[PDB]
Design a protein around this ligand. Structure first.
Ligand SMILES: *[C@@H]1O[C@H](CO)[C@@H](O[C@@H]2O[C@H](CO)[C@@H](O)[C@H](O)[C@H]2NC(C)=O)[C@H](O)[C@H]1NC(C)=O
Ligand SMILES: CCCCCCCCO[C@@H]1O[C@H](CO)[C@@H](O)[C@H](O)[C@H]1O
Length: 317
């Protein structure tokens, strides 16, 4: 696992700061903050306004989020810069205290990539609660890449990409901080996710890997968005955030929590918005940037993906 100093940011600090927002407070003076990292094709509010923003507030936290432009569709390595910057700011802004990070979809890959290549935030992140993370990417993006209808981050989130290869070779498939990964075998966006083993894309060694069906049975069905918004997900998430070990505890949930519908504590308005969470993301992808090659790895990641090919050619140290 990489150690020492953090790589330099490619983006100006002012640009990175502009992508960070907290509810009812400034990052420089915030009480009990939680960092929310959005999924592909969305902004912070679009991913969590109908779910974990009001839910985390009820848990006593001040929700903060990043919204890397455009709609998390650009280079994952740059999206990670926004998170690394946000963690540094919130840590100091909360009185030099560790803070929890809650993510969805790409947000999980971004978090784990940051913990792997930016050693300084490792002592600043209390725990990681990732919903439907794609650490090994997804095999479903392949056809889209071939037709050149994939945004930069979709290329990188494709199984076998130079970025996912770099994460694995750098030791990023093992948990770095106390991590809980909640996912579903019936995810229509991220696959493979069916084996309930290391083969799954959401699996991290030594982490608390919770495949919904392993707990609720083969008849339990929640999709990519459901993995984040369901009542089952809320119970598992609340367990992870309250746990003294930093990971969700099996003793906190059971079969009676296996409710595929949006979290019960959400208002009717929020429940409807949560059910249609994937709609805004799909529109962003249809109207967003598209290219015919995977973004080049930055200098610090190149040694871990030698032989792979990116937009400029074959990767070398
Ligand atoms: C989207 O990602 C690309 C690639 O990382 C960014 O482009 C780089 O930006 C830095 C800083 O301005 C430049 O030094 C590099 O030369 C750029 N590289 C390429 C290949 O363009 C870009 O800034 C990002 N855009 C947004 C809006 O996040
Ligand atoms: C007459 C039969 C009614 C069956 C109702 C099943 C309701 C479960 O539907 C659930 O809706 C959630 C919100 O969109 C999704 O996130 C879940 O994936 C889905 O399983």
């Amino acid at each position: 696992l990489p150690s020492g100093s953090d790589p330099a940011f490619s983006q100006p600090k002012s640009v990175l700061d502009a992508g960070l927002t907290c509810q009812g407070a400034s990052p420089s003076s915030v009480s009990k903050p939680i960092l929310l990292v959005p999924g592909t094709g969305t902004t912070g509010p679009q991913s969590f306004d109908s779910n974990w923003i009001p839910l985390s507030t009820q848990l006593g936290y001040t929700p903060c989020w990043i919204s890397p432009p455009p709609f998390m569709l650009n280079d994952t390595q740059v999206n990670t810069e926004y998170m690394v910057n946000a963690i540094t700011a919130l840590y100091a802004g909360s009185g030099n205290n560790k803070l929890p990070v809650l993510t969805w979809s790409q947000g999980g890959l971004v978090a784990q990539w940051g913990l792997t290549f930016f050693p300084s935030i490792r002592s600043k992140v209390d725990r990681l609660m990732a919903f439907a993370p794609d650490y090994k990417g997804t095999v479903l993006a392949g056809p889209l890449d071939a037709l050149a209808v994939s945004a930069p981050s979709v290329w990188q989130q494709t199984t076998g990409s130079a970025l996912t290869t770099a994460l694995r070779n750098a030791g990023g498939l093992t948990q770095i901080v106390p991590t809980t990964n909640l996912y579903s075998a019936t995810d229509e966006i991220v696959q493979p996710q069916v084996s309930n083993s290391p083969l799954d894309s959401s699996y991290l060694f030594n982490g608390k890997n919770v495949q919904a069906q392993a707990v609720c049975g083969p008849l339990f069905v929640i999709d990519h968005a459901g993995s984040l918004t369901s009542q089952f997900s809320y119970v598992v998430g609340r367990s992870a955030l309250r746990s003294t070990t930093g990971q969700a505890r099996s003793a906190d949930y059971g079969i009676t929590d296996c409710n595929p519908l949006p979290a019960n504590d959400l208002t009717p308005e929020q429940k409807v918005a949560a059910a249609a969470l994937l709609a805004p993301a799909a529109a962003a992808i249809v109207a967003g940037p598209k290219q015919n090659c995977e973004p080049d790895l930055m200098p610090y990641a190149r040694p871990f993906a030698v032989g792979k090919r990116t937009c400029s050619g074959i990767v070398t140290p």
